[model samples]
Target: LTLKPVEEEHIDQFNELLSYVFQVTEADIEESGFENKRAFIKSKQPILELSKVFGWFHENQLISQIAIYPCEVNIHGALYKMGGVTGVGTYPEYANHGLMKDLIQTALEEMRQDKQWISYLFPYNIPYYRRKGWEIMSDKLSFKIRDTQLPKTVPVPGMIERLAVDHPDVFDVYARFARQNHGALIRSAFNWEEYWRFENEEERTAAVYYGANQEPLGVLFYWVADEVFHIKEMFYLNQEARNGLWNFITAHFSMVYWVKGDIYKNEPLAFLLEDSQIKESIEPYYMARIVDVKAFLENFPFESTAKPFHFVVKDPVAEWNNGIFGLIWDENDQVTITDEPLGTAVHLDIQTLTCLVMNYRRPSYLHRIERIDTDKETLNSLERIFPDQEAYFSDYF
Candidate 1:
């Protein structure tokens, strides 16, 4: 058996594996339509420099695979390089051979070499990934609101205008929002194209909110169907832009019975409306892993005055991640990390540690749940070292 990088010439074989493993269809080409699939495969050709596919080969045939795309992500307002994982699958016949385990470890080693200490994936199965050291890091709330429930007006110093689907201002607004929000991807040009890929007949449209000075501050991508207005994505840099976009959606009451959209778990859309009653549901959305825990913590953003703490992280898959870590913040807000095992430490596996550091779950909650092992003194230190911050990942892949 051999594990190696997938050659560009073999993408078809890789796609065939994905089709069989994921039960993907070739007919629609609209969403994952046949044509769309072909275009997407071709799109990867240009980014071969920034992305890679690794596969397990037995008897000279590909049997299991995982792909990685190197990108940047916002972590508590700081930019950190991230490895986005996708197209993970194993041939049914080879499922028990531990091929995926090896592939993932190889990926992590490569990510560490590239200085990408964090990884993200849209999980096919939450529990399966959880055991591999990835933890649920963010959730999305999908909700429906009656047209009458929409705010009749939101006073703001901005105006909303429809824009071309490929308008440059859309990227500008989103880039600004991504920088301010945690877990948002710093999308590249190709990422933008991928985000807009849809069936030709899909009725998606876009609008941007402009401040009094005509600067773009917010953007919304949406469509209307069956008397319902659906938001594909919405982002704003300030409260005014958010209110302006909400008013824009409310204006559609004449043509739609309801407005529906998915937002980060912390969104307060329901509370902001005149009729605060709306149907909303929150569900786990994305999973994350620390590819290089020590490297990740070195660049982690924490409050300047956060007291130092020790952590003992156990990683079942990555051997390098199993160690005692010393983390301290300097007077200048810079973090200094060491693996010397020299102080009182909180013990937890990589999965729990990821959640705690990302602020997806408070350390106290994890302690009560017995997901982590730490005494009151260490927990108190942790609570200060790892200040709670909002985790909001909106991009898919």
Candidate 2:
């Protein structure tokens, strides 16, 4: 048995192990019609070439593996390096051998060394990931609006035009949105490929909203079929752009009976529409963990404050974060962090801390729910330092 990085030469075994463990059969690929088995196998190259992947091999056969794609994200308006964890799988026979545990630790170590202070993953098992120090950072609001319930033709200064999904204007709109929106992925070329990997590109379309000045402000990736308008993604920089998007969607009412879409922001789509009775379901979308708590805090975009905060974090998986942390803004407006024992500090697990820092749940709510152990003064201070915005992350690896 051996443990090593899964490189280009090992792509075949890497592909094989993932396929077997994830049960991606050839029949399934054929049925999905997104891409053929060969193309899918070939697509693994980007992950191998761009990510840090490690695996365990038994007598030259891949048995277990994990991968972390170095990425970037916007955390409360501050762009920070991120590690997108994926390609995690282990054969049934190789389970419980502690291979994955070691692999995850190694990934965290490398991520911290690379200054990837935070990590994100689409959890297959929420409880399992939560126990490993990750917590919910965003929610996905799936909505279904009948044609009659769709918003009436909205009037805006912008005009929406259909364009190719790969249009530069579409990319420009996303780039602008991701930078300004909290918890959004700064999409790389590899990220874009993965975004469209499982979806048929031939059928998808990009409808971009251009302002009166001809500047792209929003992009909607969608497709229509079976009397349904499916929205893969919709991002707008302003309310006018959002109105334009709704205008475009309502234009299809003559052809489609239902409009289905997903919203990642905390704002409920039902409330934004005149027909507030539309069916919508909200669920945890992605889980995130602060790999290097000190580094993350140093980069955090805390509100201007002279007050200091002291807290103790308990992380079950990462030892680097399991300690007492002291954070304060210096007279020069620079952040200062300390690890020494701080008196009368709040105590919370890393999972809860991640949720709090990510702004998914407010400090008051967490305190009422008994997630944070702190005094009223400390809770009020926390609420002051943290932003008043919830994360709006929609990307999936």
Candidate 3:
């Protein structure tokens, strides 16, 4: 068996392996009629060409593989280079040989060299990825509001207009919102393609809210089928737009019996509504890892008042993050790393460290769970540095 990069010429093999492992049979595709075979390949070529893919083969028969796309994300008001991990699979016989472990290590090395300090994935198996140096970084709250529970429309300065999902105004609104929201993917053309890849485009629509002055403030992507209004996602700049977008959804009450949507933030949507009794379920969504923890921490935006501290990270996958590291704040309020402890040191595994740094889980909570081992003083210091707000990541790979 030989391991090598999966190039454009290997697209056939790449798709075959992925389809076989994922159990997407040719008959299923033909039956659903959801995708035209030629159009599917055409849509996937750009993504395959742009990704860094590696595979294991036995006499030219592809057996196992992984892929990474160069991506960018907002982390606590700071933009970061990110490695989007996807297309992971192996034949049943290929599993347990540790092919994926080596593939992931190689991906991490490439990400480190490219300065992609972070990586994110939509986990198929949480424990499997956790053992490979990843942890939950965000939550997905799926909610259902009955027609009677929909909020009553309130007066707002903005007016809503319908547009294509790919409209320029829609992109502008997301870009502006992501500039301020933590853990938001800064969607490029490729990112947008991935966003719409699995969905039926025929029924999708975008409702953009424009302020009285004609500035776009929000965008909502939704569709209606079987008397249900399914909200793909929503983004707004301020309270006015949020209410305005809801008003639009409420307007659909006559046509749909229920409004089903997702909330990416930690907070549940029920408490914010008048009914306060909507059906909602929250679960872990995206997983992330700090590919180069040092690099990520150095660029991390910490409160100016945060003091120096030390920590030791135990990474099961990447040795680059395993060690004692000091976080020092200079006179200019800049953070710098050091090899030795400058103060009390905390002990944590890579998963705990990743989630804590992402602000998805509170330091105090992790401390309570024994994921973090440290003195009270150090824990207090950590609380002051990490943001109190939760991440806002809604995209899938």
Candidate 4:
């Protein structure tokens, strides 16, 4: 058994192996978005150029494969090389062989070694990944709101219509919101392009909502497939745009089995559903890391009306965040800091920070892990600075 880069010469065998693993035919590739996978392989050409693809071969037969996409996740104002794991497959014959663990461990090592400390994936099963040292860092809430719940109705004046051929104008609105939102993704041209084209197998016409009178204050990107009205993305400039889009969905009034959308912590959709009876669920959304601790600390956004405190972050994985980290901020964005000499008193480690960044751990809770070594005063101060919203990134990595 050997692990190596996916070479073009191996594409045919690789496809054969993956098809068997997925239990689908070659013709299903297009609908499966396997076409994109094929294109990715073809574009990879000599294969060496695409360091993202990796495969495992046994006795010269491709048996397993995993791929990572190169992209940037906005951390504060800086960017980190985000490796989004995708297209993982293995032959059934190789099942229970511990192949995936080995494959993933190798990929993670490579990613970390290359300084890509952050990675993400849309999990088929969350439990599987959690044991692999990944945790639910961020989460979202889905609310069922009756139209009556809309904050005292104001007549929506915008013309609600599909976004025309030029969707970038609407996409720019999304970018505007993303730019200002502290933890939103700094979506690039590629990410936005794929978003507009996203759809399910049924191939229903993709649609976007535009409020003409309101001058396109918001946009909703969605497609219907497999009876699921999966909402891909929504960008609303204000409450007006948000209402217009909701009006459009309400028009369906449960014709579609369900409506789903990625939402930030501040989402009020649950309270706006006209039929409070609609079923909904929300879970932790995204996770983030402070790639450059010092830099992140300097530019980190702290909510106003915060209490003052210092942290002795104990970083077991990365040393940069291990020492004493003291931060004080006010409503004006003014900040003050005092660094204490490093010795033993560090509390949470890098892993704990990853958890705390997503609100996985509360201030007082860290003490149970024996990770935090601060006094009650400092602990209270630390909790005061971090809000329950727990900073989030909604994009699918």
Error of 1 at 175 (Å): 1.2
lDDT by residue (278-364, candidate 3, tens digit) is: 779999999999998888888888855456778899999898899988988878777888888888889999999999888888899
The per-model lDDT (C-alpha) reads 0.81, 0.85, 0.86, 0.58
Off by more than 4 A, model 3? 23-42
Query: Which has the better lDDT: candidate 2, or candidate 3?
Result: 3
Ranking by lDDT: 3, 2, 1, 4
lDDT of 2 by residue, 93-185 (tens): 878788888888889998999999999998877887788789999988898889999888767987878998988898889999998989999
Count of backbone collisions within predicted model 2: 0
In candidate 4, position 249 carries an lDDT of 67
lDDT comparing candidate 4 with the true structure: 0.58
- For residue 309, give model 3's deviation from the true position in Å: 1.5
What's the number of clashes in each of the models?
4, 0, 0, 17
For the record, the alpha-carbon RMSD of candidate 2 to the native fold, in angstroms, is: 2.1
> Candidates' TM-scores?
0.93, 0.94, 0.94, 0.67
**Tens digits of per-residue lDDT for model 4, 1-397:** 9888776677677656644554334554455454654453333233223457788888688889877666655443345566666557888788788787777776765666566656666665566665454555666765433433333434677756665534566667766766544455667765654443323323433244456544557777666555455565566778777777767765664456556665655454545654455545667665444443444455444443334555566543344555666665556768765475332243665556656554556767876667677676666655765545544465653
- On lDDT, the stronger of 1 and 4 is 1
Superposed Cα deviation of residue 353, candidate 1 (Å): 1.0
Per-residue error for 179 in candidate 3, Å, reads: 1.2
